[PDB]
Amino acid sequence: KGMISVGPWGGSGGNYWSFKANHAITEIVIHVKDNIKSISFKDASGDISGTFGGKDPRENEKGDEKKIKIHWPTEYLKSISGSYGDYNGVLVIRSLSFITNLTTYGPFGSTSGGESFSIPIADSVVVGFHGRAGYYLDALGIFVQPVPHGTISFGPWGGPAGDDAFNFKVGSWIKDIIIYADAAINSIAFKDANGHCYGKFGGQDPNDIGVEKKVEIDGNLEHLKSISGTYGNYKGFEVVTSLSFITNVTKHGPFGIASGTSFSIPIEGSLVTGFHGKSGYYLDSIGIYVKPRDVEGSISIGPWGGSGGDPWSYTANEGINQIIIYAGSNIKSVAFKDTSGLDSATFGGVNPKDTGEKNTVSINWPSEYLTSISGTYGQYKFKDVFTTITSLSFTTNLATYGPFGKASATSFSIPIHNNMVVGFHGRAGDYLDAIGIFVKPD
Amino acid sequence: KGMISVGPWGGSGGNYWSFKANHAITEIVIHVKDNIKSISFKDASGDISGTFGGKDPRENEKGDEKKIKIHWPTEYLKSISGSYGDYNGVLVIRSLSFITNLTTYGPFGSTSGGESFSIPIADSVVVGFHGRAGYYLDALGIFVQPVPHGTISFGPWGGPAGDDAFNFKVGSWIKDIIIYADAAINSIAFKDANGHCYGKFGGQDPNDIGVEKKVEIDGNLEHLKSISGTYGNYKGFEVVTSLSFITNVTKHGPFGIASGTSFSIPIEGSLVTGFHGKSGYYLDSIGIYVKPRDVEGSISIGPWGGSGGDPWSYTANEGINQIIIYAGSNIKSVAFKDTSGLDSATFGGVNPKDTGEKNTVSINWPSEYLTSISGTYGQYKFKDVFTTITSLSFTTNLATYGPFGKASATSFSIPIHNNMVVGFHGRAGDYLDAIGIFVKPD
Numbered sequence: 001k002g003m004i005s006v007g008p009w010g011g012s013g014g015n016y017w018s019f020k021a022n023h024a025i026t027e028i029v030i031h032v033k034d035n036i037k038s039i040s041f042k043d044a045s046g047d048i049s050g051t052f053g054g055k056d057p058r059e060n061e062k063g064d065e066k067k068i069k070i071h072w073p074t075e076y077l078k079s080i081s082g083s084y085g086d087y088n089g090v091l092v093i094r095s096l097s098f099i100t101n102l103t104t105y106g107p108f109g110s111t112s113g114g115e116s117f118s119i120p121i122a123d124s125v126v127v128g129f130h131g132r133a134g135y136y137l138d139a140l141g142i143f144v145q146p147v148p149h150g151t152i153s154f155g156p157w158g159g160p161a162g163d164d165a166f167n168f169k170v171g172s173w174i175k176d177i178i179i180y181a182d183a184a185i186n187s188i189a190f191k192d193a194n195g196h197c198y199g200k201f202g203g204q205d206p207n208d209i210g211v212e213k214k215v216e217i218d219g220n221l222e223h224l225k226s227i228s229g230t231y232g233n234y235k236g237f238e239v240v241t242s243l244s245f246i247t248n249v250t251k252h253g254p255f256g257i258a259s260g261t262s263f264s265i266p267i268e269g270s271l272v273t274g275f276h277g278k279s280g281y282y283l284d285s286i287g288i289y290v291k292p293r294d295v296e297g298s299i300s301i302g303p304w305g306g307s308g309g310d311p312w313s314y315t316a317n318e319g320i321n322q323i324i325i326y327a328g329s330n331i332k333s334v335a336f337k338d339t340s341g342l343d344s345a346t347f348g349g350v351n352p353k354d355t356g357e358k359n360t361v362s363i364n365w366p367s368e369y370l371t372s373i374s375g376t377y378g379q380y381k382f383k384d385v386f387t388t389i390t391s392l393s394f395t396t397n398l399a400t401y402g403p404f405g406k407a408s409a410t411s412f413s414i415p416i417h418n419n420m421v422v423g424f425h426g427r428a429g430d431y432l433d434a435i436g437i438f439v440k441p442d
Numbered sequence: 443k444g445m446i447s448v449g450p451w452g453g454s455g456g457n458y459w460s461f462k463a464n465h466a467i468t469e470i471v472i473h474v475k476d477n478i479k480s481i482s483f484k485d486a487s488g489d490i491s492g493t494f495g496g497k498d499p500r501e502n503e504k505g506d507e508k509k510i511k512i513h514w515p516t517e518y519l520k521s522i523s524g525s526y527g528d529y530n531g532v533l534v535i536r537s538l539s540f541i542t543n544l545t546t547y548g549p550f551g552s553t554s555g556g557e558s559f560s561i562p563i564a565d566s567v568v569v570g571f572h573g574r575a576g577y578y579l580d581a582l583g584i585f586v587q588p589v590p591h592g593t594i595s596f597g598p599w600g601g602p603a604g605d606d607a608f609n610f611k612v613g614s615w616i617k618d619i620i621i622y623a624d625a626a627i628n629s630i631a632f633k634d635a636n637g638h639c640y641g642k643f644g645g646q647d648p649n650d651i652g653v654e655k656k657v658e659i660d661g662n663l664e665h666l667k668s669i670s671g672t673y674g675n676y677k678g679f680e681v682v683t684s685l686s687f688i689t690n691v692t693k694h695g696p697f698g699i700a701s702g703t704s705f706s707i708p709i710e711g712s713l714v715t716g717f718h719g720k721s722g723y724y725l726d727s728i729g730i731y732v733k734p735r736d737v738e739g740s741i742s743i744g745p746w747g748g749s750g751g752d753p754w755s756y757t758a759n760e761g762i763n764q765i766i767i768y769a770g771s772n773i774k775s776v777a778f779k780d781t782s783g784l785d786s787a788t789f790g791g792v793n794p795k796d797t798g799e800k801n802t803v804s805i806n807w808p809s810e811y812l813t814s815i816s817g818t819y820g821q822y823k824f825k826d827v828f829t830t831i832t833s834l835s836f837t838t839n840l841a842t843y844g845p846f847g848k849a850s851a852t853s854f855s856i857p858i859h860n861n862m863v864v865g866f867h868g869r870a871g872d873y874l875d876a877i878g879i880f881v882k883p884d
């Protein structure tokens with residue numbers, strides 16, 4: 001269920017409305033003359049939304065009807081564009097286009113006397129609409145979810161160059177942003193909630209590195225929702241000149257100096273889970289990956305095992321697909337891949353002289369899906385003595401995998417049903433001290 | 443979130459629509475002349491639904507606007523009534539009333555040349571609408587949830603007499619219906635999924651007991667959703683003459699003979715969790731309690747303990763409030779009460795010579811709410827030896843209660859977070875062999 005809200009664009013009059021389709025959106029009905037008088041929708045199984053707007057009593061204000069058909073299932077709605085501006089003294093949607101994987105329908109309505117809006121988005125499917133309406137359509141936005149196996153992406157914003165591409169996604173959340181900036185963004189780097197570090201992207205100029213600044217996000221109160229900033233000329237290059245980091249709680253920034261063309265993205269319900277773009281001497285361009293926060297919550301069970309190691313966690317963006325376990329007489333490390341390409345770091349295995357042997361559990365998701373873990377923990381001795389997970393099995397709705405490592409005296413399991421494992425968490429250092437799961441009903 | 447759907451009433455033309463309010467419904471706007479051209483809604487924070495219907499191009503067909511205001515928060519919508527019939531050759535909603543805890547608004551529209559509908563409902567709050575619409579409002583129904591601490595109730599249907607009132611609600615599900623019938627319903631009785639028996643309601647006539655019939659519902663495929671039947675004259679008395687039991691899978695019945703006035707209730711998303719009415723020699727009247735099935739699911743953890751005892755389970759209708767535990771050196775029995783008055787049977791304690799001592803855990807719900815259990819199980823000897831829960835504690839978001847009984851060698855717990863316990867299950871006989879929990883995220 002969870003979706004990201006984009007926009008809306010237009011004026012602030014009218015009453016809030018939303019429509020979340022129960023099946024793919026296959027028709028958009030609008031009433032148009034100079035502006036958008038009204039809008040409604042229809043889904044693949046004939047369900048309709050109400051009509052939003054169109055409340056002008058004046059008859060010469062009804063507007064002409066246009067039906068946009070989406071040739072489902074080979075064509076699907078992915079985005080919109082259009083324009084807002086004044087109409088009879090009200091800030092209102094004036095024109096609209098509907099962007100599909102195959103073509104664009106529109107523009108509909110007047111394309112003058114406006115201010116246009118568009119969305120630098122990828123891997124999205126529009127699963128609903130929202131906006132403001134009164135007599136007319138004051139404002140319009142969309143509800144998006146990722147495409148199967150994908151991740152919603154916005155941007156990148158900035159210049160066109162940068163010899164070094166970068167691109168990563170996290171399985172926890174962004175906790176630290178380290179920026180060197182002055183008037184421009186010289187470089188950027190990020191830390192996981194697990195402490196894993198991404199990049200330095202940029203900062204290759206020996207005679208110009210900029211001034212450091214750090215943003216530290218407390219996961220108990222705050223989470224990265226979005227970014228904004230500015231890009232334009234720096235010493236002859238087109239690069240990012242300022243950035244702000246937007247959370248549910250506040251705006252951190254701006255860093256660098258605001259010059260050139262400013263950018264932002266009006267999203268709600270989003271957790272930034274990564275970044276992509278290009279860099280070189282400086283940060284040429286940057287974009288975000290974003291995931292819907294759920295309405296659901298996840299239950300956390302465990303962890304079981306020793307009480308050393310640094311805390312770590314991994315939640316699938318989609319479905320956990322693959323588990324890599326290094327084992328010998330205990331468990332050295334654990335790693336996860338998911339159906340959307342989200343690959344965890346390796347948790348454990350920090351000691352090159354004790355790495356164990358690689359094992360792979362491959363899960364055909366979603367027909368097969370993880371269901372719980374069981375195993376043992378206890379003493380393990382290399383040079384020193386440790387308390388770690390020593391043996392470990394994984395259960396799915398279809399089968400059991402392992403055991404891996406060696407059984408020891410203290411065993412654990414979870415008599416659990418009607419659930420699926422959506423993620424893992426625990427503690428690791430040289431080995432896998434402790435491990436637990438995140439679950440959801442089904 | 444889960445709500446019960448009632449209706450809709452009217453014709454089968456138009457397109458399906460629904461509106462689920464995010465805040466209490468405070469306004470209904472209708473366009474009316476002879477029939478209902480169109481409808482829309484507004485909630486406590488200004489959110490609007492779209493307009494449903496009103497698509498006649500003919501301007502002499504727009505209809506007059508009427509605004510029904512709900513004086514929230516002291517007044518709330520509870521039900522509707524109205525009528526459907528023909529209009530320009532289409533089966534359509536013609537009149538409507540809106541029933542509140544304080545008054546009825548309407549009727550609006552024509553009250554002639556229809557067929558009226560009404561709803562014998564109790565303890566409901568309307569949290570949304572659905573229906574069919576095209577040019578006009580072809581059909582309308584409601585979405586309901588129970589009032590705080592209540593249970594939605596329909597009926598009772600039948601005659602006005604019956605010296606013996608009956609009334610019960612189950613914390614699992616209805617598995618067996620035992621009816622004795624010839625031409626009318628002489629008596630009715632029901633079994634829980636736990637095997638607990640309710641009544642015999644009726645059957646007091648020594649010279650007329652009727653013929654037995656049983657309905658056995660398999661919880662793996664099927665669940666009681668609803669009832670229908672007939673009532674009217676039997677040997678001078680006004681009583682229930684036939685009944686059918688409607689599940690998701692089929693209609694079981696009719697039992698007795700269909701004579702007099704027939705009744706039914708068009709509901710979806712419901713689980714029948716009890717019955718109420720009055721009886722004597724025969725079944726004079728019968729009504730149902732229902733609960734919304736969830737969209738959510740519950741995760742089941744455990745049970746822990748011995749492997750004897752009959753399976754039992756209890757799921758709060760609202761919030762678990764009170765736990766009654768009889769203990770001595772092991773656990774004899776367990777029972778539960780919730781904030782809506784749903785009281786479980788006693789699980790365990792079947793032996794009058796070994797009952798232990800009563801204990802009470804009182805939870806102030808919802809500020810305080812159950813979070814998990816822990817304890818021990820092992821041997822306990824009275825005359826024979828048994829393996830049961832021997833000690834038991836309960837954890838809430840605020841505190842821990844117990845231990846009750848006596849610790850023994852095998853202990854259990856659940857390292858769990860971000861959840862609430864919405865119910866219990868296990869096995870019991872003379873004592874509490876085993877116990878587990880149902881959980882949900884939060």
Ligand SMILES: OC[C@H]1O[C@H](Oc2c[nH]c3ccc(Br)c(Cl)c23)[C@@H](O)[C@@H](O)[C@@H]1O
Pocket residue numbers: 013014015053088090133134135136137138
């Ligand atoms: O859809 C645009 C407007 O619709 C309603 O506005 C009007 C109400 N009475 C009017 C008379 C005239 C003109 Br022009 C307008 Cl917009 C209105 C109200 O809902 C306004 O908030 C909203 O901005």
Ligand SMILES: OC[C@H]1O[C@H](Oc2c[nH]c3ccc(Br)c(Cl)c23)[C@@H](O)[C@@H](O)[C@@H]1O
Pocket residue numbers: 161162163164237239279280281282283284
């Ligand atoms: O980040 C700004 C620019 O940095 C790099 O370009 C260079 C900038 N100053 C230099 C000096 C030397 C050499 Br060699 C190179 Cl590539 C550069 C390259 O990454 C460019 O594509 C990028 O646009």
Ligand SMILES: OC[C@H]1O[C@H](Oc2c[nH]c3ccc(Br)c(Cl)c23)[C@@H](O)[C@@H](O)[C@@H]1O
Pocket residue numbers: 307308309310384385386428429430431432433
């Ligand atoms: O992987 C498990 C261990 O790895 C890291 O610790 C150690 C590294 N080299 C060592 C040598 C000895 C002893 Br003793 C310990 Cl804990 C360590 C630390 O993270 C420990 O907390 C953790 O338990």
Ligand SMILES: OC[C@H]1O[C@H](Oc2c[nH]c3ccc(Br)c(Cl)c23)[C@@H](O)[C@@H](O)[C@@H]1O
Pocket residue numbers: 455456457530532575576577578579580
């Ligand atoms: O809501 C009533 C009707 O609206 C639409 O109907 C009509 C379409 N073209 C027409 C011409 C005339 C008359 Br009369 C009617 Cl109802 C229609 C369609 O959606 C019908 O399914 C629906 O029953």
Ligand SMILES: OC[C@H]1O[C@H](Oc2c[nH]c3ccc(Br)c(Cl)c23)[C@@H](O)[C@@H](O)[C@@H]1O
Pocket residue numbers: 603604605606679681721722723724725726
């Ligand atoms: O069949 C339902 C009827 O059964 C009871 O009434 C009696 C029916 N036949 C009788 C014979 C005797 C005595 Br005494 C009584 Cl109460 C009755 C009473 O419970 C009536 O209120 C009820 O309507």
Ligand SMILES: OC[C@H]1O[C@H](Oc2c[nH]c3ccc(Br)c(Cl)c23)[C@@H](O)[C@@H](O)[C@@H]1O
Pocket residue numbers: 749750751752826827828870871872873874875
């Ligand atoms: O308290 C739980 C026990 O009570 C019931 O059994 C017994 C009743 N009287 C007995 C005497 C002896 C032995 Br041994 C047993 Cl299991 C019983 C049955 O429910 C058993 O399955 C259950 O383990």
